A paper describes a structure:
Here we show that in addition to small-molecule antibiotics, Streptomyces produce and secrete antibacterial protein complexes that feature a large, degenerate repeat-containing polymorphic toxin protein. A cryo-electron microscopy structure of these particles reveals an extended stalk topped by a ringed crown comprising the toxin repeats scaffolding five lectin-tipped spokes, which led us to name them umbrella particles. Each contains an amino-terminal twin arginine translocation (TAT) signal, two sets of four ALF repeats (ALF1–ALF8), two extended coiled-coil domains, and variable C-terminal and toxin domains.
Our maps enabled unambiguous placement of UmbC1 into the Umb1 particle. Although the entirety of the UmbC1 ring was clearly resolved at the centre of the umbrella crown, the density gradually decreased in quality towards the distal portion of its stalk. The C-terminal toxin and HINT domains of UmbC1, which, based on our model, would localize to the tip of the stalk, were therefore also not resolved in our map. Given that our map is derived from >350,000 individual Umb1 particles, we assumed that the UmbA portion of each spoke is effectively an ensemble of the four UmbA proteins in a stoichiometry consistent with their representation in our sample. We therefore elected to model UmbA1 at each spoke position because of the following reasons: UmbA1 is the cognate UmbA for the Umb1 particle; our purification of Umb1 particles on the basis of epitope-tagged UmbA1 ensured that UmbA1 populates at least one spoke in each particle imaged; UmbA1 is typical of Umb1-associated UmbA proteins in that it contains a single lectin domain (unlike UmbA4); and UmbA1 is accommodated well within our maps at each spoke position. At this location, the domains are readily accessible to ligands, an arrangement compatible with a role in target cell receptor engagement. The structure confirmed that UmbC ALF1 and ALF5 do not bind UmbB1.
Residue numbers in the entry:
A (entry chain H): 42 to 165
B (entry chain I): 30 to 287, 292 to 297, 307 to 323, 332 to 351, 356 to 369, 371 to 385, 395 to 405, 408 to 417, ...
């Protein structure tokens, strides 16, 4: 029996990504895609888990995707400001505003040394 | 729907709708400037069981953009949905907008189903083979595999499956530049989609329903403030006398007896005057097979008070003159020995010419009392064997409300 052709804003293929890269994805506005890192870099996320890293591509602005990546430590930006929400081990969340065309870190490689988790990645 | 992007003004009657902030999204198309047709499942808590999608306001704020083929530009119109009218049997709903979009034409509806082998096209804002959400809408190509009870089964031709976000999207079949809506996409195998894989390209769509739309879009033509210009005749060759009435738009609308509403001067009188099989409406407007009146012509080569229909020798009019006399016309005859005419009405097969006295009494001429009480004083333009506009200008049949409320 066929499924309804209705858009629920659940990231397509998220089940396979969890199996292959170790990252998990949930809901977004559909304008951010997970892709490979091969000269097509836009927003890059580095962590010490899963397959080490992965890249995302922005299709339109504004855009967001509430992906989850444990033990993240660094982010690269390009041609755009990036608003990143991370969470500590005590459940407290904070927001870091990263500048365009630069590199910033998170807790683990930041000011606190905490093994924080990426909760939300938002495009200006 | 996986195919070439299109922004041409052939499919600018399409629409994209969203419910809530990020709750649900699906496609649709215009059937009027005020009405957009989509699937009922888009508004369901469970899209696989669109039974609880009741008529009335949307559960969540629902908005739609029309004609915006390219999402990166401001081109197109944005309207809010105020009311929903679900189909009583199948997965289909009509959305009423707060405001009209008079600039964008609707798509015509098909008169019948496509058959197996028929080349159909489809357009929508759903997922592609490589994008979760597209920038521009895309057009695909499908063929009919079979037709079922109120639905059409289709398959992708050379791939191009119906995917996700295509629900509510139109199925189209064109001929000689004219596009007709043949159905609305509901479910699919979703093969060849971004983020997923399956071989099958099969999909199912609800069959287009012209009557459902007609009785919803035009649901409120009457019941409001109508003129007294009402007349009866058979305008659909059904064997049942229908009713036509003039509305505030200055046009004459036909309401068909089962009154259901159709699609398309001091006194008005109808009847099949020339025995042509199509009811007509001093100039005679002749009826045609399509229910549309032709250009009128003079019935002759100003002191008459009332004129109503009357059948003479199987075929006619009766005119009440200011002198109190009543004459029938085919050649004319005297209807009554003296000047004793009273409100003149049309005829009906009571067993006969109906009439109303100034004292409110109703009677008929072969007069004899036709109604136990005397409450017909305020009644005007009584038409025909069942037989008044009423004090609220709502036609009653003798007094049942033939008109909806």
């Amino acid at each position: 029996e066929m499924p309804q052709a209705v858009e629920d804003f659940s990231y397509p293929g998220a089940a396979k990504i969890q199996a292959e890269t170790g990252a998990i994805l949930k809901r977004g506005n559909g304008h951010m895609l997970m892709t490979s890192c091969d000269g097509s870099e836009d927003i890059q996320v580095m962590s010490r888990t899963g397959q080490k890293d992965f890249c995302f591509n922005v299709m339109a602005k504004p855009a967001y995707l509430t992906l989850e990546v444990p033990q993240a430590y660094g982010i690269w930006t390009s041609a755009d400001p990036v608003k990143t929400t991370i969470k500590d081990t005590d459940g407290t969340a904070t927001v870091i505003n990263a500048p365009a065309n630069d590199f910033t870190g998170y807790g683990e490689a930041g000011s606190t040394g905490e093994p924080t988790t990426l909760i939300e990645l938002r495009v200006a | 729907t996986v195919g070439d992007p299109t922004t041409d003004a052939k499919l600018d009657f399409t629409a994209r709708l969203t419910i809530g902030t990020d709750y649900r999204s699906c496609s649709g198309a215009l059937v009027d400037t005020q009405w957009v047709l989509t699937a009922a499942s888009c508004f369901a808590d469970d899209p696989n069981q669109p039974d609880t999608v009741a008529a009335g306001k949307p559960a969540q704020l629902t908005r739609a953009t029309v004609g915006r083929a390219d999402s990166n530009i401001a081109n197109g119109y944005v309207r809010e949905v105020v009311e929903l009218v679900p189909h009583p049997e199948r997965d289909m709903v009509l959305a009423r907008l707060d405001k009209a979009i008079p600039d964008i034409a609707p798509v015509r509806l098909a008169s019948d189903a496509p058959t197996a082998g028929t080349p159909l096209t489809a357009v929508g804002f759903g997922r592609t083979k490589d994008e979760w959400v597209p920038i521009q809408r895309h057009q695909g190509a499908f063929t009919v595999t079979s037709v079922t009870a109120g639905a059409v089964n289709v398959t992708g031709q050379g791939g191009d499956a119906i995917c996700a976000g295509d629900t509510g999207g139109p199925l189209l079949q064109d001929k000689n530049g004219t596009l007709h809506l043949v159905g609305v996409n509901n479910r699919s195998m979703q093969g060849g989609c971004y983020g997923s894989e399956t071989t099958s390209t099969d999909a199912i769509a609800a069959m287009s329903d012209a009557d459902f739309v007609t009785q919803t879009v035009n649901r409120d033509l009457g019941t409001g403030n109508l003129s007294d210009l009402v007349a009866s005749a058979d305008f659909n060759s059904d064997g049942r006398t229908d009713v036509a009435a003039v509305l505030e738009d200055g046009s004459l609308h036909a309401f068909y007896a089962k009154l259901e509403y159709g699609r398309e001067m001091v006194q008005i009188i109808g009847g099949d005057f020339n025995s042509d099989g199509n009811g007509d409406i001093l100039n005679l407007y002749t009826g045609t097979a399509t229910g549309i009146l032709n250009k009128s012509k003079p019935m002759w080569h100003k002191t008459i008070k009332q004129v109503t229909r009357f059948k003479f020798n199987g075929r006619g009019l009766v005119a009440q003159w200011g002198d109190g006399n009543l004459y029938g016309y085919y050649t004319k005859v005297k209807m009554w020995p003296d000047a004793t005419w009273t409100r003149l009405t049309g005829t009906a097969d009571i067993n006969d010419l109906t009439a109303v006295r100034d004292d409110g009494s109703l009677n008929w001429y072969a007069a004899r009392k036709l109604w136990p009480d005397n409450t017909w004083t305020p009644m005007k333009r009584i038409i025909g064997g069942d037989i008044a506009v009423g004090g609220q200008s709502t036609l009653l049949l003798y007094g049942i409300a033939m008109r909806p409320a």
